[PDB]
Amino acid sequence: SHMRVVVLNWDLLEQVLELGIQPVGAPELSSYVQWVVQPEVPSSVQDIGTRTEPNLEKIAALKPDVILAAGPQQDLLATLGRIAPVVYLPNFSEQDNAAQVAISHFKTLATLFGKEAVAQQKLEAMYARFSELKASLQHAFGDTLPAVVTLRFANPTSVFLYTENSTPQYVLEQLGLSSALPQPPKEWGIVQKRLSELQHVEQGYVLYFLPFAEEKKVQKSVLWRAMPFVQAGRVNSVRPVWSYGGAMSLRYSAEAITESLLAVAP
Amino acid sequence: HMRVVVLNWDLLEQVLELGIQPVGAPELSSYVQWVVQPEVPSSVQDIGTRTEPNLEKIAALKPDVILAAGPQQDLLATLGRIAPVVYLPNFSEQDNAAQVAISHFKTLATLFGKEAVAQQKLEAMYARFSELKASLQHAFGDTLPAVVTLRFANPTSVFLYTENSTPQYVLEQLGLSSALPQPPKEWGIVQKRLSELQHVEQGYVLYFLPFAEEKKVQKSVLWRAMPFVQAGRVNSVRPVWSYGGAMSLRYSAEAITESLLAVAP
Amino acid sequence: GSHMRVVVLNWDLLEQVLELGIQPVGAPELSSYVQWVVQPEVPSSVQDIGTRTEPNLEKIAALKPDVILAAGPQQDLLATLGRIAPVVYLPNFSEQDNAAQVAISHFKTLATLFGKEAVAQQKLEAMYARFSELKASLQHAFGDTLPAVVTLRFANPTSVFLYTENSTPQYVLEQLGLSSALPQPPKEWGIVQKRLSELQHVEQGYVLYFLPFAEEKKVQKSVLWRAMPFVQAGRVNSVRPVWSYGGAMSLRYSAEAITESLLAVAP
Amino acid sequence: SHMRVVVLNWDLLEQVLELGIQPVGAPELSSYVQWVVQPEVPSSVQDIGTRTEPNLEKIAALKPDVILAAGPQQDLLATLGRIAPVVYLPNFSEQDNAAQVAISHFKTLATLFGKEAVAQQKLEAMYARFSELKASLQHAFGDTLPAVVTLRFANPTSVFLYTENSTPQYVLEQLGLSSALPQPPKEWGIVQKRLSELQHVEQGYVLYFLPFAEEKKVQKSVLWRAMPFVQAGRVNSVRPVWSYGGAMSLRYSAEAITESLLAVAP
């Protein structure tokens, strides 16, 4: 029903908002509109601190009926229980297929909040949306879709490649895109490799998620300009979509990758 | 008869080659396509994939031991709560692949008491090596050609095998020269462009099967212009896992030799 | 037996030989050695046979060696040295050499030649294992994002020797999972001489410089160095003396040296 | 223990083979079985080109762990080191006593490759063989062994006399034979004199090493038949033994000279 929900992670914040549920508390709302962006966070929701170090004084003042915690708040579950009952929905382990798990959590949250019908409408619409971008991608590339590298910059010299169990990997598979640089499953679906290792990617297309404060710095480097995919024009920037989000995150990133990959096409 | 669960294809071969039949093994469907040679019995159940094994299934089999390799190193802690784990890593940039695959074959033998069976196979392997070398010298020799061993990534990229790889080891055991040596790397491979094979004029090029885009590459525009292709010094090696166990060295030796005995003068 | 009379002419080979349990009768610049290489302590018995660039042929021949180990910088003397004793030529720092890998490959080759193969494998396995520990200690104290590090040696108070992609400090950084923070294309000896002004744009990364450097205090109090972003942010430290152009065990000593100096000035 | 060795000179090829070591590459294998012949090169060993001018492409293709170079390859040491570690064992200078150096190199190579025991056994067997041949030589020459000239034909008009620092000279001394025409130490242990100079070796023996493609031409020539040692019947042909080989070369040349000198005896 209409309970007073406090989420402590950005993926759960998205999931709850997407279900038509409006929480009373959520972490890092200022950074949220820069990194996650896609599921706009209403004016009512108060910033209860960070995902790693939530404000216990503040969440208790909001009088929650439930506290939704994910992976990074697992050491606080006992602590959070002193304030209100906790529903722990973890994700993005080395074992979790992130995306699949994000959907199963999306369904579970729906049943608990009675918004079970709304969940089904969005999920089937997302699956239909996948094929829509896939169709628009083969119509622009010719039924042999290219191989794509999805990453986020770690430092101006280091890069987070997304692994096989990550959500961008799931998106690539749903779009019919190939994995230009596959990686074994890891936590959060990422692997930190050096940027110089991308000197050998002479074949596919490389997409990097926004924001990155030092984008110009890397772009102005001798190393980045020497990249095969850069001079060949097979590289673009994906509009800000949280790669560690919820179920609808898969959709938003699907529309974001496709839009950024329909560009820089032959 | 212990209840063994292997989580990697090399260990699966090693354990099977010792006459031991595990209760769990990864990617059994894909196994009969890429490694194929040590045929996995009908009894063994698919416990998921290599990189991403299913803990629920492995725990449901109630194993007495779990054999994990390199790609499962981040799961070792979790697996120990299911059953005692034997961690046998291999194919790093520092590992000589072949020796380590043999030493692991020996270690697995002693742990499982099948010490005699292991030695018998190893003696048969070394003997088979010299056998193939002789048959190569009777078809090429006494000056054996230089050979490139690779796997296709895509019709434009190629996985060349490095100095620490198992195909490199096989070539040296057959007395064959390395037509395109490479510095040590992880899993023993380097991904190069197909265009790099434009200057390997004198010698032989072998590529391992399967490759879904073989049909595309053989009649492809870039590949037919290759020197070793026009000279007819190129053939396809029957599917043998280049990242396997000890007996992989034998199977790949017999596979390369048989595929190289063809297209000979 | 392998109880042989070895004369080394380069510091890396001196290290390789000492680490294998072999004690040479001659080695170059022993006085300067304990200041720059330091780590593999040179025994009291081994005599100083001159420098690396200009070895004393009269002295090395007087020691009556059974074998002479010469490296890259002594290649122009190989023909003359064979007249004294059989020579083993082990190069290791061109722009195409992966320095570290070959230093290990030379460590293995030298081991087999001197029969010290078992100790070599033991040393290498202990080094490789130590790498993962240091990497582990680095992902701890730091985020899920290993930092970007610049490794260099001071040439003068205004110029710096940055290490390239084929250098041994670079190999160490890569084994630790660290980024290059200022990568450079492969060059001879693994270095490039840049102006100190090149460190003006390494803002969010880390800068480490190897010891010794006689004018570090001079640079520390200099106007340009204090204006450096990594200096004001406190992300800069001095690495304890480890030879950047050494042998296989040089990689281990330099890995522990970099990690410890980078565990400091960490968040 | 079992390394991949590539030798670039015939002497080093012999030394390594006598130690039970089997190289993967060796120079001039076709000509080797014509000039050196005794330490038979296995079928497995591949021809890496000629001496002085080795095939770098082939040597690198064999993936050697060591490259054994001698005198004539001294200008290639820098290039060879770029392929694999090089062990440079020079010999046959004006200062080298060839034979001693050939043995000391045989020992060092033995120590380096661990086949040290086999070396001492062979060397000790060689010294013992010397006295055996000397005895069979003294029983046929009246215990006062004659003076012998050892040479190789350059052309039908010139002859390569072997000097005091050469390996056949060492052989003559170990057999107790005198030097019927000694020469001051020179490079490769040889001196090129005109054939007309052998007119003065009257009261001695002359031995020439095989092969020589124009032996019949010289044998029926007017100048050679007019030689004092020829008319006196004190001349014979020594079976092919490499005068610039290794330690066991000294043995092979000892039994070859003795066998060729047991003939033409009174």
Side-chain angles (χ1 to χ4, degrees), chain A residues 2-266, chain B, chain C residues 1 4-267, chain D residues 2-266:
Chain A
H2 318 324
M3 290 183 317
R4 291 198 133 242
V5 184
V6 168
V7 293
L8 304 184
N9 211 42
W10 277 352
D11 56 338
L12 296 186
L13 174 54
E14 159 194 347
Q15 299 281 62
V16 147
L17 280 182
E18 214 75 29
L19 288 172
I21 306 282
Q22 175 167 356
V24 317
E28 298 184 52
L29 296 184
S30 184
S31 305
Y32 178 91
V33 78
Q34 220 204 323
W35 289 93
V36 184
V37 173
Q38 291 303 152
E40 172 130 343
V41 51
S43 314
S44 67
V45 186
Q46 306 185 3
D47 194 314
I48 43 88
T50 62
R51 288 86 57 73
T52 69
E53 212 165 25
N55 190 293
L56 298 178
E57 299 164 346
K58 272 167 171 185
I59 71 168
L62 289 259
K63 293 165 163 181
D65 299 314
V66 276
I67 303 176
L68 304 192
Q73 299 97 17
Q74 73 183 335
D75 296 324
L76 298 174
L77 297 179
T79 300
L80 294 167
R82 252 70 168 65
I83 301 182
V86 181
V87 182
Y88 174 63
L89 307 102
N91 196 7
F92 301 96
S93 73
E94 235 241 24
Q95 350 242 335
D96 296 319
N97 280 14
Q100 281 75 9
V101 184
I103 301 182
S104 291
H105 284 353
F106 184 69
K107 295 179 183 177
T108 297
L109 282 176
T111 306
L112 288 180
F113 290 142
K115 298 302 241 178
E116 199 163 354
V118 186
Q120 175 60 31
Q121 295 175 6
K122 284 189 163 292
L123 287 179
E124 65 187 15
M126 175 182 74
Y127 294 151
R129 184 48 180 180
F130 284 166
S131 191
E132 283 187 356
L133 298 340
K134 185 180 178 166
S136 73
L137 280 167
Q138 38 207 13
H139 185 275
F141 283 96
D143 291 36
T144 65
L145 291 86
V148 188
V149 173
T150 58
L151 62 92
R152 275 193 156 101
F153 286 87
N155 315 121
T157 52
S158 186
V159 148
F160 284 120
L161 298 178
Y162 284 96
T163 70
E164 89 174 24
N165 76 294
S166 63
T167 71
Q169 175 68 19
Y170 173 83
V171 168
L172 295 180
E173 296 178 7
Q174 293 298 321
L175 298 181
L177 299 168
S178 306
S179 305
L181 213 54
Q183 295 291 330
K186 296 280 192 262
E187 183 169 41
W188 295 109
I190 64 181
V191 166
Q192 186 174 7
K193 295 291 187 60
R194 307 181 318 275
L195 182 56
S196 58
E197 294 190 32
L198 297 184
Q199 282 177 326
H200 280 331
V201 196
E202 280 147 289
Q203 285 90 123
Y205 287 77
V206 174
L207 305 180
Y208 59 94
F209 297 96
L210 295 181
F212 178 53
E214 296 173 311
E215 173 182 28
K216 202 59 185 296
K217 178 161 182 300
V218 178
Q219 280 179 320
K220 282 177 66 274
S221 66
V222 282
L223 172 64
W224 172 262
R225 296 186 182 183
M227 297 294 174
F229 52 87
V230 166
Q231 46 190 322
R234 312 192 218 94
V235 55
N236 195 221
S237 68
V238 180
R239 62 176 194 95
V241 45
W242 194 235
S243 308
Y244 325 105
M248 233 52 192
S249 168
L250 309 176
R251 176 185 197 143
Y252 299 143
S253 58
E255 299 177 34
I257 287 184
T258 303
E259 158 186 287
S260 168
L261 191 62
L262 276 193
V264 318
Chain B
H1 181 86
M2 223 178 178
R3 297 200 95 249
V4 185
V5 168
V6 291
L7 304 184
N8 212 43
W9 277 353
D10 54 17
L11 297 187
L12 174 53
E13 159 194 347
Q14 300 282 62
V15 71
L16 280 182
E17 214 75 30
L18 288 172
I20 307 148
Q21 299 190 5
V23 193
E27 298 183 52
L28 296 184
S29 57
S30 305
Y31 180 92
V32 298
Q33 221 78 33
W34 289 92
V35 18
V36 325
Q37 262 76 207
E39 174 176 330
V40 43
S42 51
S43 306
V44 186
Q45 306 185 4
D46 194 314
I47 43 88
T49 63
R50 289 162 302 160
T51 93
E52 213 165 26
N54 189 294
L55 297 178
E56 217 293 314
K57 270 53 184 176
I58 298 174
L61 292 181
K62 205 264 163 292
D64 299 314
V65 59
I66 302 176
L67 304 191
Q72 299 97 17
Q73 75 182 58
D74 297 324
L75 299 174
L76 296 179
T78 302
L79 293 167
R81 291 193 178 68
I82 302 181
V85 182
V86 181
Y87 174 63
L88 306 139
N90 197 8
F91 301 98
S92 72
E93 182 186 313
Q94 18 285 336
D95 296 319
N96 215 275
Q99 280 75 9
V100 232
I102 300 181
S103 64
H104 283 353
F105 183 68
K106 296 178 183 177
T107 297
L108 282 176
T110 49
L111 288 180
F112 289 139
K114 299 303 241 300
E115 306 182 64
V117 187
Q119 176 177 13
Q120 192 275 326
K121 284 190 163 292
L122 287 179
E123 292 169 0
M125 176 185 324
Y126 295 152
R128 185 48 181 267
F129 284 166
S130 191
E131 283 187 356
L132 301 178
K133 185 180 179 166
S135 72
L136 281 168
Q137 289 186 341
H138 186 275
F140 284 96
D142 291 345
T143 8
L144 291 315
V147 188
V148 172
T149 57
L150 62 93
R151 276 193 156 101
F152 284 96
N154 58 85
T156 54
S157 292
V158 148
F159 288 121
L160 297 177
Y161 285 95
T162 69
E163 89 174 24
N164 76 294
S165 63
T166 70
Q168 175 68 225
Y169 173 83
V170 168
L171 295 181
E172 295 179 7
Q173 292 298 321
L174 298 181
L176 299 168
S177 306
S178 305
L180 213 54
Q182 297 292 331
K185 202 129 242 182
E186 183 168 285
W187 295 109
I189 78 286
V190 284
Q191 187 173 8
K192 295 291 188 60
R193 329 87 201 161
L194 182 56
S195 58
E196 293 283 284
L197 297 183
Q198 191 76 16
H199 278 331
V200 49
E201 240 117 20
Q202 304 275 337
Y204 289 77
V205 172
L206 306 180
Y207 61 95
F208 296 96
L209 294 181
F211 179 52
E213 297 271 81
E214 174 181 28
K215 287 277 185 175
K216 178 162 181 193
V217 69
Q218 280 181 319
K219 282 182 68 56
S220 66
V221 282
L222 173 64
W223 173 263
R224 295 187 313 181
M226 227 65 66
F228 54 84
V229 167
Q230 287 175 342
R233 312 192 219 94
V234 55
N235 196 28
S236 68
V237 179
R238 68 173 199 251
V240 280
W241 196 235
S242 308
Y243 325 103
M247 232 50 57
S248 292
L249 308 176
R250 175 186 196 109
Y251 299 144
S252 58
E254 299 176 348
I256 286 184
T257 303
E258 159 185 358
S259 168
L260 191 62
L261 276 193
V263 318
Chain C
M4 224 178 179
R5 291 199 133 242
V6 185
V7 167
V8 292
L9 304 184
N10 212 43
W11 277 353
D12 55 337
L13 297 186
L14 174 54
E15 158 194 347
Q16 299 281 62
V17 145
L18 281 182
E19 214 75 30
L20 287 172
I22 308 282
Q23 299 190 5
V25 317
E29 298 184 52
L30 296 184
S31 57
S32 181
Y33 179 91
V34 298
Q35 307 293 340
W36 288 90
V37 184
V38 174
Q39 291 318 288
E41 174 176 330
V42 42
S44 313
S45 67
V46 25
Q47 306 282 348
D48 194 314
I49 46 88
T51 147
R52 288 84 55 73
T53 312
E54 307 280 45
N56 190 294
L57 298 92
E58 217 177 14
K59 274 165 65 161
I60 63 173
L63 292 181
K64 292 166 164 306
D66 299 314
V67 59
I68 303 176
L69 305 192
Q74 299 96 16
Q75 73 181 258
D76 296 324
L77 297 318
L78 296 180
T80 86
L81 295 169
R83 294 191 268 188
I84 303 181
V87 181
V88 182
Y89 174 63
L90 306 138
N92 196 165
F93 296 97
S94 72
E95 92 176 33
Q96 339 221 333
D97 296 318
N98 281 14
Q101 281 189 336
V102 19
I104 299 182
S105 181
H106 283 353
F107 184 69
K108 295 179 183 177
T109 296
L110 282 176
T112 306
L113 288 180
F114 289 114
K116 300 302 241 178
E117 305 183 64
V119 56
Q121 253 301 314
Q122 295 174 6
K123 286 263 189 177
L124 288 179
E125 292 169 359
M127 176 182 74
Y128 294 149
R130 184 47 182 222
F131 284 166
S132 58
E133 280 189 355
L134 301 178
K135 185 180 179 166
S137 72
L138 280 168
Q139 37 208 14
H140 184 275
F142 283 95
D144 293 86
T145 310
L146 289 314
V149 188
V150 172
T151 57
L152 61 93
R153 282 191 162 273
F154 284 96
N156 58 85
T158 53
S159 72
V160 289
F161 287 136
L162 298 178
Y163 284 97
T164 69
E165 281 173 31
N166 77 294
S167 63
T168 70
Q170 174 67 19
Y171 175 84
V172 167
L173 295 180
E174 295 178 7
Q175 292 298 320
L176 297 180
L178 299 168
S179 10
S180 306
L182 215 176
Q184 297 291 149
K187 297 280 291 263
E188 183 168 44
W189 295 109
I191 67 180
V192 283
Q193 187 173 8
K194 295 290 188 172
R195 197 181 192 228
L196 182 56
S197 313
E198 171 84 348
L199 297 183
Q200 192 76 17
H201 33 88
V202 48
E203 354 234 5
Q204 84 302 321
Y206 288 77
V207 172
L208 305 180
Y209 60 94
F210 296 96
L211 294 181
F213 179 53
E215 294 175 311
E216 70 149 355
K217 204 60 60 186
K218 177 59 67 270
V219 177
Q220 279 179 319
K221 283 180 305 174
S222 65
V223 186
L224 173 63
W225 174 264
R226 295 185 59 254
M228 295 294 174
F230 54 90
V231 167
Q232 287 175 342
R235 311 192 218 94
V236 55
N237 195 10
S238 68
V239 180
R240 63 176 194 95
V242 280
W243 195 235
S244 309
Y245 324 104
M249 233 53 195
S250 167
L251 309 176
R252 179 185 199 278
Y253 298 143
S254 58
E256 299 177 82
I258 286 184
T259 303
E260 74 172 279
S261 77
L262 190 63
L263 277 194
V265 319
Chain D
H2 49 13
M3 291 180 66
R4 289 197 90 90
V5 185
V6 168
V7 292
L8 304 184
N9 212 43
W10 277 353
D11 53 17
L12 296 186
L13 174 53
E14 159 194 347
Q15 299 281 62
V16 145
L17 280 182
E18 295 289 340
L19 288 172
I21 308 282
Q22 175 167 158
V24 317
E28 298 183 52
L29 296 184
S30 184
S31 180
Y32 180 91
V33 78
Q34 221 78 33
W35 288 91
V36 184
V37 79
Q38 287 92 28
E40 173 177 330
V41 166
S43 52
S44 305
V45 186
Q46 306 186 4
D47 194 277
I48 43 88
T50 62
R51 289 161 302 159
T52 69
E53 307 179 350
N55 188 23
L56 298 178
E57 298 273 6
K58 236 305 183 287
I59 298 174
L62 292 181
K63 293 286 273 186
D65 299 314
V66 272
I67 303 176
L68 305 192
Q73 298 97 17
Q74 74 183 335
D75 40 18
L76 298 173
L77 297 180
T79 302
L80 294 167
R82 298 194 184 294
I83 304 295
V86 181
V87 182
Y88 174 63
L89 307 102
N91 196 7
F92 301 97
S93 304
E94 182 185 313
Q95 346 284 333
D96 296 318
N97 281 14
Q100 280 75 9
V101 184
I103 300 182
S104 181
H105 283 353
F106 183 69
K107 296 178 183 177
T108 47
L109 283 176
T111 306
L112 288 180
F113 289 114
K115 299 302 241 178
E116 199 163 354
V118 186
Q120 176 240 189
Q121 191 275 326
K122 285 190 164 178
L123 287 179
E124 203 160 359
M126 176 183 74
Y127 294 122
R129 183 47 181 222
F130 285 166
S131 294
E132 282 188 356
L133 301 178
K134 185 180 178 166
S136 72
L137 214 51
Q138 289 185 340
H139 186 275
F141 283 94
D143 209 278
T144 7
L145 292 195
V148 188
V149 173
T150 58
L151 62 93
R152 195 181 302 264
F153 285 90
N155 59 279
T157 326
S158 292
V159 148
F160 287 136
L161 297 178
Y162 285 97
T163 70
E164 281 173 30
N165 76 294
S166 63
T167 69
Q169 175 68 19
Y170 173 84
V171 168
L172 295 181
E173 296 178 7
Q174 292 298 321
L175 297 180
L177 298 168
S178 306
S179 305
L181 212 54
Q183 296 291 331
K186 298 281 241 263
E187 183 168 286
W188 294 109
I190 66 181
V191 166
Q192 186 173 7
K193 295 291 188 172
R194 253 181 80 180
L195 182 56
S196 313
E197 293 192 33
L198 296 183
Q199 283 177 327
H200 155 69
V201 48
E202 194 147 288
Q203 305 276 83
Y205 287 77
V206 171
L207 305 181
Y208 62 95
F209 297 96
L210 295 181
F212 180 54
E214 294 174 311
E215 174 182 29
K216 279 47 190 175
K217 177 162 181 193
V218 177
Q219 279 180 319
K220 236 318 183 70
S221 66
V222 186
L223 173 64
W224 173 263
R225 296 185 314 181
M227 296 294 174
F229 53 89
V230 167
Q231 287 295 330
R234 311 191 218 94
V235 56
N236 196 28
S237 68
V238 179
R239 73 175 209 254
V241 280
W242 194 234
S243 309
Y244 322 102
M248 301 310 289
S249 167
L250 308 175
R251 177 185 197 143
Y252 298 145
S253 293
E255 32 207 27
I257 284 184
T258 303
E259 159 186 325
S260 168
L261 192 62
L262 276 193
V264 318

